[PDB]
Design a protein around this nucleic acid. Structure first.
Ligand SMILES: [Mg+2]
Ligand SMILES: [Mg+2]
Ligand SMILES: [Mg+2]
Ligand SMILES: [Mg+2]
Ligand SMILES: [Mg+2]
Ligand SMILES: [Mg+2]
Ligand SMILES: [Mg+2]
Ligand SMILES: [Mg+2]
Ligand SMILES: [Mg+2]
Ligand SMILES: [Mg+2]
Ligand SMILES: [Mg+2]
Ligand SMILES: [Mg+2]
Ligand SMILES: [Mg+2]
Ligand SMILES: [Mg+2]
Ligand SMILES: [Mg+2]
Ligand SMILES: [Mg+2]
Ligand SMILES: [Mg+2]
Ligand SMILES: [Mg+2]
Ligand SMILES: [Mg+2]
Ligand SMILES: [Mg+2]
Ligand SMILES: [Mg+2]
Ligand SMILES: [Mg+2]
Ligand SMILES: [Mg+2]
Ligand SMILES: [Mg+2]
Ligand SMILES: [Mg+2]
Ligand SMILES: [Mg+2]
Ligand SMILES: [Mg+2]
Ligand SMILES: [Mg+2]
Ligand SMILES: [Mg+2]
Ligand SMILES: [Mg+2]
Ligand SMILES: [Mg+2]
Ligand SMILES: [Mg+2]
Ligand SMILES: [Mg+2]
Ligand SMILES: [Mg+2]
Ligand SMILES: [Mg+2]
Ligand SMILES: [Mg+2]
Ligand SMILES: [Mg+2]
Ligand SMILES: [Mg+2]
Ligand SMILES: [Mg+2]
Lengths: 60, 185, 67, 144
RNA sequence: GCCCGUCGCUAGUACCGAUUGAAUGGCUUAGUGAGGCCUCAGGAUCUGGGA
RNA sequence: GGACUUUUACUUUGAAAAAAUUAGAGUGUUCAAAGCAGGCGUAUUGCUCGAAUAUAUUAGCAUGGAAUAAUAGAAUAGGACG
RNA sequence: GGAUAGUGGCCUACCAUGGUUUCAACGGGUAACGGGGAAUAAGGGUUCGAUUCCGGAGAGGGAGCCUGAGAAACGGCUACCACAUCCAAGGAAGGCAGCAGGCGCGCAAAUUACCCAAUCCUAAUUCAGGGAGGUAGUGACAAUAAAUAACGAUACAGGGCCCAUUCGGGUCUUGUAAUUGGAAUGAGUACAAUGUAAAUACCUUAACGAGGAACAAUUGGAGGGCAAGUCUGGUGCCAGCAGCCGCGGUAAUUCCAGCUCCAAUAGCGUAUAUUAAAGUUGUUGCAGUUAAAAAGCUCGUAGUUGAACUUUGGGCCCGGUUGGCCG
């Protein structure tokens, strides 16, 4: 095939995606507490049974 | 040239990694008995797995065979000890049954909660790891201590910490330093 | 706290049947301090190079300051 | 019986014939011929460290149109010459000629990866560090 | 629609191949042959035949 | 003690058998991986349970079996007992 | 016969022509020290063992030998070969596959520390010596336990539920909350004593030591396999992704980011090897008309395999070991 195609564009897109910085958020508990948070989420309170059950919905 | 220090691993991990049913089924267990790892379930299901293996093997041998009668009876009496196996079901055809939650139910974290002391299974975790509650005056700080029958009665706070008497805590006593300093001399 | 204890029939016995370091802890013995265990090793080796007492080796090397 | 001797002393024939037929097994024959130690640009070892000759722009196989960016490396224990790929956006801007780099395999047991024809390895580190970390920013490329 | 081979380009692997080509390792002919050991002598000296 | 014995395979039970590892009994190393401890009192001059068991197959040894499968026997009788 | 401690072609002299082999000799390879064992868990297997114990071999490569009970010894000597050091040029001297430490090699691996207190070993010997060994430093090789939070108050929201003609919130808690509320503990720091040969840590324990600025968890992943978005912004078959299938050529569910979400979590990714999945090596247990595969045909030696029949039926006796109804 071809082995000496241009090299100029190496890193193109990463270099030109506009930076936005992480938004400072509440800290999430680590360990047992975190499994706790998941349990009360997934099972205890329950959210929506929109036909089934959803996990990362957005604009539903 | 010095003897091998022997060791063993104490868990097995799920064959299938993303089984949605197993995954939920495991979380609730954690959520219930206040675990932090899937490993705390893994560890137990491993303990379980061998016991079944032992028992399975035994059962194949002849009824009233020496080893079977010896080691079978030993296994039964030991399971009874901690209160996993019930008294009625004392003949190993049932140790062959025997699910994980039975084991779960007998941890020191779980017992410390069951009667009084804790109120919520997590408060139970924190108290133990924090040098409160004991067996004799022997303090225990491992949530997985697994409470033998004659010990269920001797779960109680320890002669140290507050709760079980004698001195409040470093932070309370630090607020007593902010009472008699501000208002007094 | 659990440990181990001993009590000797007399103190002539204790001083003889005891470890020399134990007496140190107690005050029944001075810590005869010595050279670095390797300094001692090196003293031994330096000595092997000399056959006999050696005072005859100081003198012949005092003829050195003639040649 | 179709074939295989069933008899009670036929154990010799039964082993021989198995020895024989194992050779049709790819990895058995690779193993016993020592194809590792003999062919293979690495030793038979997990990774190998070489030196960067030219920087290549390998064009991808169809139905994929792109330019894949690689490096010809000359393995240090070997002088065997090898082209290797430089993962993630940019990163080629990290290397330069005459540099040291760490090559690992591509996880296809021999065999090249995707649309990259010819390339059987990938870079892992350069000038001592970790390509990955340089990409993020956890580290920076050493003086010379 | 599918599709076959020569012919042309890039890149890679292995093959044949003047060099009676090169290298490393293991044995080995013939020639040369250190050294200690055994043995024929020897006898500085130093004694009662020996050392 | 004398006088003589057709060969074998198979299977049985047993001896000879290093420890650590393995399987596994006992013991609450605070749990546990481990370790081989430890446990009782008169805790003032001591009492006491341990430190199992299993596996260890091929070969050699030793013993029981006599199905399965070989072997040898008496036909130019140079047969068998006496 | 000689030689050896002693058997023996071990060596010699005479003499003879034997010894091994398709039941694979002999030769080649080995990225080969053998074993106890290790990894993989239906079973049958497959792969691995330089490496804590046992045996063997070696001390840069060869050979030779002194001493001695024991060495063909190497921290013994002699010679040669290869390295190689010091010099005043005449000469002399070295052998880390001991402990540490250095170069080189490479993907790949730690202190030029302390001690004989333990375990034991040696000597003339209770005492000396012991880089055997033990102590500590380095150390995410592996393995074990398992912190990063716990409980109430209040503010609306709720689903429970008695009533509901209709205001509703009321006492049982489901919990999402941008003001709240006091309690708890070790991570560390540190008197002290414990530890230790002396120290260090651990186990204990005065004095301190938590509110988000923290004592602030990671590592990959979110199209399918495969647990988790068809959010927003960017790029425009580029840049990159993608084990495999496949994404990207202007609404990208795969790229580059923000947000949110998943999995495992003091650990998680990747590369190489191997094991399971694999009945894709098949004894258990494969397949061969057309998918890979019955030799053109018959003979045939080795090899494997090989019909039936020879004390069977019946009678007597002893004493065991579980279990039954009775104890
Ligand atoms: Mg000394
Ligand atoms: Mg002397
Ligand atoms: Mg073929
Ligand atoms: Mg090139
Ligand atoms: Mg090399
Ligand atoms: Mg047997
Ligand atoms: Mg044993
Ligand atoms: Mg002869
Ligand atoms: Mg001949
Ligand atoms: Mg053959
Ligand atoms: Mg080798
Ligand atoms: Mg091997
Ligand atoms: Mg070995
Ligand atoms: Mg090796
Ligand atoms: Mg030797
Ligand atoms: Mg060397
Ligand atoms: Mg030679
Ligand atoms: Mg030698
Ligand atoms: Mg030596
Ligand atoms: Mg001179
Ligand atoms: Mg060394
Ligand atoms: Mg040496
Ligand atoms: Mg390492
Ligand atoms: Mg000494
Ligand atoms: Mg004396
Ligand atoms: Mg040492
Ligand atoms: Mg933290
Ligand atoms: Mg904080
Ligand atoms: Mg992340
Ligand atoms: Mg999914
Ligand atoms: Mg857009
Ligand atoms: Mg988008
Ligand atoms: Mg994304
Ligand atoms: Mg994993
Ligand atoms: Mg079979
Ligand atoms: Mg098949
Ligand atoms: Mg065909
Ligand atoms: Mg045919
Ligand atoms: Mg027959």
């Amino acid at each position: 095939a071809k082995v000496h195609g241009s090299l100029a564009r190496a890193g193109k897109v990463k270099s030109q995606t506009p930076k936005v910085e992480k938004t400072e958020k509440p800290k999430k508990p680590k360990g047992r507490a975190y499994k706790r948070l998941l349990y009360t989420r997934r099972f205890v309170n329950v959210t929506l049974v929109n036909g089934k059950r959803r996990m990362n919905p957005g604009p539903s | 040239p010095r003897a091998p220090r022997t060791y063993s691993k104490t868990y097995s991990t799920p064959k299938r990694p993303y089984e949605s049913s197993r995954l939920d089924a495991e979380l609730k267990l954690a959520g219930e008995f206040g675990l932090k790892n899937k490993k705390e379930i893994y560890r137990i299901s491993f303990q379980l797995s061998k016991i079944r293996r032992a028992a399975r093997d035994l059962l194949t041998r002849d009824e009233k065979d020496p080893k079977r009668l010896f080691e079978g009876n030993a296994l039964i009496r030991r399971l009874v000890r901690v209160g996993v196996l019930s008294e009625d079901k004392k003949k190993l055809d049932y140790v062959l049954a025997l699910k994980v939650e039975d084991f779960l139910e007998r941890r020191l974290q779980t017992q410390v909660y069951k009667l009084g002391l804790a109120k919520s299974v997590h408060h139970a975790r924190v108290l133990i790891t924090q040098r409160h509650i004991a067996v004799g005056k022997q303090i225990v700080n491992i949530p997985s201590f697994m409470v033998r029958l004659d010990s269920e009665k001797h779960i109680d706070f320890a002669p140290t910490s507050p709760f079980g008497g004698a001195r409040p805590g470093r932070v309370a006593r630090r607020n007593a330093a902010r009472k008699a300093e501000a208002s007094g001399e | 706290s659990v440990g181990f204890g001993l009590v000797y029939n007399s103190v002539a016995e204790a001083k003889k049947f005891e470890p020399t370091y134990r007496l140190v802890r107690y005050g029944l013995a001075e810590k005869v301090e010595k050279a670095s265990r390797q300094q001692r090793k090196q003293k031994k080796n330096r000595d092997k190079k000399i056959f006999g007492t050696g005072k005859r080796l100081a003198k012949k090397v005092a003829r050195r300051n003639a040649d | 019986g179709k074939g295989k001797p069933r008899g009670l002393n036929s154990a010799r024939k039964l082993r021989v014939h198995r020895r024989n037929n194992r050779w049709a097994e790819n990895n058995y024959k690779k193993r016993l011929l020592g194809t590792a130690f003999k062919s293979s640009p690495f030793g038979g070892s997990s990774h190998a460290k070489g030196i960067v000759l030219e920087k290549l722009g390998i064009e991808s196989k169809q139905p994929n149109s792109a330019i894949r960016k690689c490096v010809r490396v000359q393995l240090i224990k070997n002088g065997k010459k090898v082209t290797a790929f430089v993962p993630n956006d940019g990163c080629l801007n990290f290397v330069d000629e005459n540099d040291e780099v760490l090559l690992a395999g591509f996880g296809r047991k021999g065999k090249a990866k995707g649309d990259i024809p010819g390339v059987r390895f990938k870079v892992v580190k350069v000038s001592g560090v970790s390509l990955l970390a340089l990409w993020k920013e956890k580290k920076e490329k050493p003086r010379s």
